[PDB]
Amino acid sequence: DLPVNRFKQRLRSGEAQIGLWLGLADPYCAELAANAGFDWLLLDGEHAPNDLRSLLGQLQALAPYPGQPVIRPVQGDTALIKQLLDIGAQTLLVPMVDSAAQAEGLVRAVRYPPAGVRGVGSALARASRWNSVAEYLNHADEQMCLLVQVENLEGLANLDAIAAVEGVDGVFIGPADLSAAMGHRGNPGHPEVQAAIEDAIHRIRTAGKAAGILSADETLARRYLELGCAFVAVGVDTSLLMRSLRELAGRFK
Amino acid sequence: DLPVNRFKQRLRSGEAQIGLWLGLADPYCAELAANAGFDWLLLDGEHAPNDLRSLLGQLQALAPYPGQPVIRPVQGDTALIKQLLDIGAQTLLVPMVDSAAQAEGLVRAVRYPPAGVRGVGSALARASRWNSVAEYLNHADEQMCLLVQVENLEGLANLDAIAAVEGVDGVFIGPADLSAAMGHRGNPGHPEVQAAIEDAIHRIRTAGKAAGILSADETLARRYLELGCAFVAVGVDTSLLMRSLRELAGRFK
Amino acid sequence: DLPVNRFKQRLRSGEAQIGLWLGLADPYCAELAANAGFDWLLLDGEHAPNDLRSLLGQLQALAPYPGQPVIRPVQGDTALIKQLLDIGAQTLLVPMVDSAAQAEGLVRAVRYPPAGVRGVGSALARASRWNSVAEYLNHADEQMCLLVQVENLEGLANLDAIAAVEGVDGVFIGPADLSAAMGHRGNPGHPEVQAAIEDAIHRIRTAGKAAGILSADETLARRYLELGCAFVAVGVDTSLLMRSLRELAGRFK
Amino acid sequence: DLPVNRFKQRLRSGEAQIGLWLGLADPYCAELAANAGFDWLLLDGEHAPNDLRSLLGQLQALAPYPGQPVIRPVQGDTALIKQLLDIGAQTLLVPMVDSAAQAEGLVRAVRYPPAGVRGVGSALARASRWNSVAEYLNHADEQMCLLVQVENLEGLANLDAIAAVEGVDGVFIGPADLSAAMGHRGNPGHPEVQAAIEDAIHRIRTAGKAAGILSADETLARRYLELGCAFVAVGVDTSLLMRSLRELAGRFK
Amino acid sequence: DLPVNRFKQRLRSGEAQIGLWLGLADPYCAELAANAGFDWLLLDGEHAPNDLRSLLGQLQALAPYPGQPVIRPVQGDTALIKQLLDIGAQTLLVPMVDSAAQAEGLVRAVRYPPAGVRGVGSALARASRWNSVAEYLNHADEQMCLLVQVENLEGLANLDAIAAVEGVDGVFIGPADLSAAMGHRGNPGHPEVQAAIEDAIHRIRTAGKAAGILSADETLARRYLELGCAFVAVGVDTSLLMRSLRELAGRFK
Amino acid sequence: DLPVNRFKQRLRSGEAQIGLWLGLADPYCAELAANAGFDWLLLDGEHAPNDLRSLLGQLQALAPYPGQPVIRPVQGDTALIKQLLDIGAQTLLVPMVDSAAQAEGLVRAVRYPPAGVRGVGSALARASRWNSVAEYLNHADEQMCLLVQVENLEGLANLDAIAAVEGVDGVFIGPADLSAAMGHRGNPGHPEVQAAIEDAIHRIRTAGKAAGILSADETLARRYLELGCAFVAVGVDTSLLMRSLRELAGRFK
């Protein structure tokens, strides 16, 4: 009984999915996030102090709750992706995808041969529940969801080719990196950046793929939802906690 | 150069100290809290999944920041107090203190002979920074700050005599347990419990000691500060995050 | 939405519940067992190298699966029980219960005041999902399941009184401890030990309580099931693994 | 007194070595396996949730026993192999070895200069026992044992070149990856795959190198030993534990 | 094949055993000490930040080397002693032993019934190698070695009775606590303390038991060995590390 | 208030900085070293069993003390460097830097766009204290300090070019690898290596950059300081501990 990837399902549905960014890098701190009611949670392996085993611990904490886990590897390395797939991850958000050719390789990385180059060691890992899931090899590709991050000028230039790649379910726009690449580091609200984001969202959707984004700014997140983004992250756990703590302290000092 | 206990100092001054409760039990999750500007942080060893090594991890993380660490052991056991002193804790919040005789024993547990029964083993622990602190054995008692929790109806009856035990610097009022003990479980706003809490605060102050309380309710905390409490916790890190997370999701679902 | 204790429910039903003993003391090794199909899993804090934090990880790994977790503390200590309850455990197997008065104290240990002495800290703990559960304090007592171990001569003498204690849902017989107590250390199959166990099961059942036992021996486990035991543990994860591995090696050497 | 690699020695002797695959990724779960009686134990860093620190813990747990540890890195990366060498691993099973040139790079990666490119930092590492081993730098190469995995079509085509490389002590055949590569994913029993495997074993032996394989099927493993395989793994710890537990449950449900 | 307690063996031979105190509380830091050449290593569970899981890791790290491990629990608690025995510790140094009645209880705690009160759960524990050791229950007592610390005035007065207790293999003198108890806190060199220590050593030996002590001062440690101490600890790893590091800095500052 | 890199400051002053190498890979073992009085501490991610999370723990332990932390990654990989920058490291010692082109790339790895290629994810990271540091993005580059290791013949040939690179504050000479590269493995004292080192220190200094080196030999370290090295490491923590222990043991055996 192969686990169904509900996040991949809803990407093709009409309704958008609201997400939370998890950077606390702890299974206990993560179980709290699983209780908040988000449709999906992003375990960040690129900018938070996460390793394979702590990602494994967070996957265990999240499993009972409705929110769907998405893992962002530090880079789109084949060996790292292979390890993330074996611990049970079915949706990956790969950063720094600059070209269609790079994206085509990422699709092969998540597929068993003939379709791909994913190594076969499923029996030993959580992904097949240690060979409990019958016919895992024949159907695992069906439940993988690949999301690519476009965050620099070259990726923006190749956006139409990257979104076109077969197997790329979604294209994620990282306003933080894109803004800095465009010369407005730390100012994603700038109209030049906003226009690029709005144009990027349109190009992704006409290719038939889901557009995704992260905004701690809620009104800005509402704008991205209005423009048709399929998956949107509306907060960061470390930032929400850090702001809440300092404001609570500020009220009494 | 024996570390000076600033929390113990500020207690004797006229300024109250604003605090935060730490139940995330992770040195990393704990360092955000240390960055929020509080006067003291409560490492909770009674109701959070902490242990001797996680409490040590959190003490290492907080040390560079202004906030003062206070540790609440699961119970006023002597072996446990010993191990917390060795890792460097200088302020303790001992729970379930019901009688002056009991508080007398706890004073002896934080003091070296002849004034107490604390074991001589400091030289190999962090408290002496591995025997770097000169004359630690002759001065350590002066930097220990013992805080007792009155949380039931025996301790409330015996509060005047508990506060008068020499070496009890502060008496802390746990409204949750106190409410339950009074038959208002989950109902600390009940005026029977508020009447007990205020009377308790006045009696501690008249004994010349420091009155402490925790209240996640900011109007109620403000009142406890207006009544003269020397140390008031104004939040719990788990609750602020759990709250912030579930309100954010609701603004989109 | 308070978690319902399904183990407690089925104890009152006609069907016996099949269990496995977990001594591997790791969240990853424990998730394999959660996949095995047992009705309940015993997380052993007495004879396995478990602490509060490792028990917490195993509870998180087990949660998605059907099997119900039972935690066995190293002893029936009040403060330890409070910690196990706060991390989310609802069924406890307390070892070395020798007298009705001790069993009566254990019932208070799992109940909130006024009725009991369980410390109140639900907002900070996993048991309430950090206060996500509405009115957790007013209904937590209903879902606690307390099981006591009778494993020596005195407990056997007071067996009728121990099972009579209100709040003692089940009485577990420990053949290894009982065998040694009776002068047949390492020989629980001895008829004097076996005669006591059959007598013990009958006395527990006429008191209206559930009788439990652990037998790695499968024919012996069937006999205990035949005698009406409500919960029987049929294996130990360490014994099964150690035995499979050396038998596999012996076949090739 | 430099540690002698008995796995490497026995390979040069007539005797075959019986092995077990370790995917539980814990020092405690690993020490049980060290008690089972195997000639060698495969600490899997490719498909099991292992990092550098967990492999080190497993090496320390393993050391008292006769079984020899073999580590499989996630990939044959020079920096990772250097880290594995410094924690004390002397035998490596490197996956995805496709060409003789790549096999040469791995041989040099385990050799100190001039012979190789292994970085010098032994005084700081367990490999030299923190410089307790006299003239470790002059004799370490002698006890390194390099094993390469041939697991795809390109590696099979270059098998004669790979086995010919000096310093490649053994060639390991991965039936799972090779079977998928040949158009028989999940069907290694197919005669095409079995013929390819037996031909590969013969060529490895005619090249003078040890041929190795993994077979959970016990009859198939005996055939591989009968064909002259020097190192054969006859089980996987996660598979054996998972199988025993669910079958034990089935006997009672 | 039951593990033999070699520390107890050398204790019964004529030669003294040289020991080192381990307070770094990490398996990696402990393996360095095992490589140093000491007869015994003291894993300090009383004044160092050690728990059950970290003591287990240190036991695993030390096992290959000649030095024998001795564990000192934080207190002579029965539940704690049982857990320490199950993880495989065979020699315990119990602090704060004041009377023969207490020492007799400690002997029973390390003995299986009928003789003692040690709980039976060895099949699940490392002590029996998870039931690999045949008839462990019938011979485990033979390999237990119990050492008691005499460190206060009441213990000194009852020294003859304590040493007389059957099952008390050795009596350990704690100079720091005894000196503080005698009114010379921080002044163990005072002749009154030294006269009491040398008299105590004589009384222990005249009872036929091994006399033990810790002396970082090397000339004083030689005196204790010449006076007949069977086991003497000549250093503390944290003190040796801290002293070497600060002196090296001073040579360049 | 962005943390100022005081290590980078003192490099531009006349005064040399005395350092210690940390390979114990534990936050607790690291805090002892933090107490020793060194100007800088090297957390070695190349030759000690350190990962990102253990390096973060040591930074938390190190922060309260004066010594400035320097991290050496296992290799100069861009994605790895991004992870070290986000956990708060401001000084990096990058191994195996052979050419100006490679050094220029490392300068980009540590600078935010436009100047560099460092990924922007600071809100989630300790480097900005989870966005407590105001306008961290505009000043982060200002406090980064890049130190390059020249440790082989190719690096030595391009040394003047490598030191000339803008943004390379210092060039570190690794005698152990350079010794082996020159055919004198294990013999850094050989005059050919020493002639190469002394020539290198001069060429590095004429470029205006800081010259750095590690020598456990104290008289050799004095010569390196006399020759004008700005940062010199005078010891290794594992070596000092291993030496103290075995020498203490030898005195009694």
Curated annotation (Swiss-Prot), chains A, B, C, D, E, F:
It catalyses: D-glyceraldehyde + 3-hydroxypyruvate = (3R,4S,5R)-3,4,5,6-tetrahydroxy-2-oxohexanoate; D-glyceraldehyde + 3-hydroxypyruvate = 2-dehydro-D-gluconate; D-glyceraldehyde + 3-hydroxypyruvate = 2-dehydro-D-galactonate; D-glyceraldehyde + pyruvate = 2-dehydro-3-deoxy-L-galactonate. The record marks 86 as: Increases basicity of active site His. Coiled coil: none annotated. The record marks 72 as: Transition state stabilizer. Keywords: Cobalt, Lyase, Magnesium, Manganese, Metal-binding, Pyruvate. Its cofactor is Mn(2+); Mg(2+); Co(2+). A divalent metal cation binds at residues 151, 177. InterPro entries: Aldolase/citrate-lyase_domain, HpaI, HpcH-HpaI_aldolase, Pyrv/PenolPyrv_kinase-like_dom, Pyrv_kinase-like_dom_sf. It is an enzyme of class 4 (lyase). Transmembrane segments: none annotated. One of its GO terms (cellular component) is cytoplasm. This is Hydroxypyruvate/pyruvate aldolase. It comes from Pseudomonas aeruginosa. The lineage of its organism: Bacteria, Pseudomonadati, Pseudomonadota, Gammaproteobacteria, Pseudomonadales.
